[PDB]
């Protein structure tokens, strides 16, 4: 195999890895790096070209092609550079210093996140997913671990990451598809129904539910119970779980967590939801009744 991307010798001339390991999966590791020339921080993602006995360089090229298309969208993590060695393709990504939005979904941080914050983060996620869907990209892995923040103190802006599972509308629900984290899989995936933009909208429903309740809508004692919860759309909307959650947020979640993907609103329709309509109080409102 000949290498396509910039050499490893150039990587090590231009960047130094730091002792901050950001992430590790079976066939990928993310490590913080610093430009030796500017001191700017980046995330270096090391993708193995050989996985499960399969040559994956074509799939990695398709993933880079999707990041490259979304680089005008500030809700999507930006790709800076690409390097390659014998076993890895290395993505130099924008560093999202706040880490995962998942942290905001733990009971511990609940008291540090307002309704205002949750409304803004969901609006920013919808802006990203709107942009992807207008370009016929379905992300298909929008778990809260795949939405990052530019900062937590104070609360910054969202960055969608990890286009490993992304496809076009109408692609087959193959073996890769049906191997997400069980609790985050849409009902149409459990039924090997075809890929829809509606699958991402299901996941935005889950993210809102988790930010607002600090609980998982679908997870059970075991995968069997998780799969029953999803396939039956068995969701806890109890007075105890929702005592401090507004009706408008409940409406937003309930419009997305529906079994039939065709009944879920689009990203565009979600951006017009009454829950997300808020006036910045520091701006001067111009009413319908003019002074003239
Ligand atoms: O998985 C991927 O496809 C890319 S992951 C990634 N990309 C860009 N910037 C950051 C910052 C991270 C952070 C993770 C983490 C964990 C603890 C404290 C701070 C942080 S900041 S992960 C990441």
What does this structure look like?
With 292 residues, the protein is of the alpha+beta class. The chain folds into two domains: 17-105, 2-Layer Sandwich (Phosphorylase Kinase, domain 1), CATH 3.30.200.20; 106-279, Orthogonal Bundle (Transferase(Phosphotransferase), domain 1). The chain has eight helices and ten strands. Strands 1-2-3-7-6 form a five-stranded antiparallel sheet, sandwiched between helices. A three-stranded antiparallel sheet has the order 8-9-10. Strand 6 (79-84) and strand 7 (88-94) form a beta hairpin. Helix 3 (115-134) runs antiparallel to helix 5 (198-213) and helix 5 (198-213) packs antiparallel against helix 7. It starts with 7 loop residues before the first helix and ends in a 21-residue tail after the last helix. 34% of the residues are buried. Bound molecules: ligand OBW. GO terms for molecular function: ATP binding; protein kinase activity; protein serine kinase activity; protein serine/threonine kinase activity. It comes from Homo sapiens (Human). This is Serine/threonine-protein kinase 17B. One of its GO terms (cellular component) is Flemming body. ATP binds at residues 22-30, 45. It is classed as transferase.
List keywords for this structure.
monomer; 292 residues; alpha+beta; Phosphorylase Kinase, domain 1; binds ligand OBW; protein serine kinase activity; serine/threonine-protein kinase
How are the SSEs placed, and which strands pair?
Blueprint: H1 8-14, E1 15-24, E2 28-35, E3 41-48, E4 50-51, E5 54-55, H2 57-69, E6 79-84, E7 88-94, E8 99-100, H3 115-134, E9 147-149, E10 158-160, H4 187-190, H5 198-213, H6 223-231, H7 247-256, H8 267-271
Antiparallel strand pairs: 1-2, 2-3, 3-7, 4-5, 6-7, 8-9, 9-10
Helix pairs in contact: 3-5, 5-7
């Amino acid at each position: 195999e000949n290498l396509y991307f910039q050499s490893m010798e150039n990587f090590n001339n231009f960047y130094i890895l730091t002792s901050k390991e950001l992430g590790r999966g079976k066939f990928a590791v993310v490590r913080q790096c610093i430009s030796k020339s500017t001191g700017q921080e980046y995330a270096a993602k090391f993708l193995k070209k050989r996985r499960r006995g399969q040559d994956c360089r074509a799939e990695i090229l398709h993933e880079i092609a999707v990041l490259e298309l979304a680089k005008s969208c500030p809700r999507v993590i930006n790709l800076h550079e690409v390097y390659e060695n014998t076993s890895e393709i290395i993505l130099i990504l924008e560093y999202a210093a706040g880490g995962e939005i998942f942290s905001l979904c733990l009971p511990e941080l609940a008291e540090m996140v307002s309704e205002n914050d949750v409304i803004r983060l969901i609006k920013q996620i919808l802006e990203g997913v709107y942009y992807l869907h207008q370009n016929n990209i379905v992300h298909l892995d929008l778990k809260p671990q795949n939405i990052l923040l530019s900062s937590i103190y104070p609360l910054g802006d969202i960055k969608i990451v990890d286009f490993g599972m992304s496809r076009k509308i109408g692609h087959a629900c193959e073996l890769r598809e049906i191997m997400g984290t069980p609790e985050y899989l849409a009902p149409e995936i459990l039924n090997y129904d075809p890929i829809t933009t509606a699958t991402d909208m299901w996941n935005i429903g889950i993210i809102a539910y988790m930010l607002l309740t600090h609980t998982s809508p679908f997870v059970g004692e075991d995968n069997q119970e998780t799969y029953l919860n999803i396939s039956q759309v068995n969701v806890d909307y109890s007075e105890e779980t929702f005592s401090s959650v507004s009706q408008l947020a409940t409406d937003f979640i309930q419009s997305l967590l529906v079994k039939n993907p065709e009944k879920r609103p689009t990203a565009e329709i979600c951006l017009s939801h009454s829950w997300l309509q808020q006036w910045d109080f520091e701006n001067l409102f111009h009413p319908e009744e003019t002074s003239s």
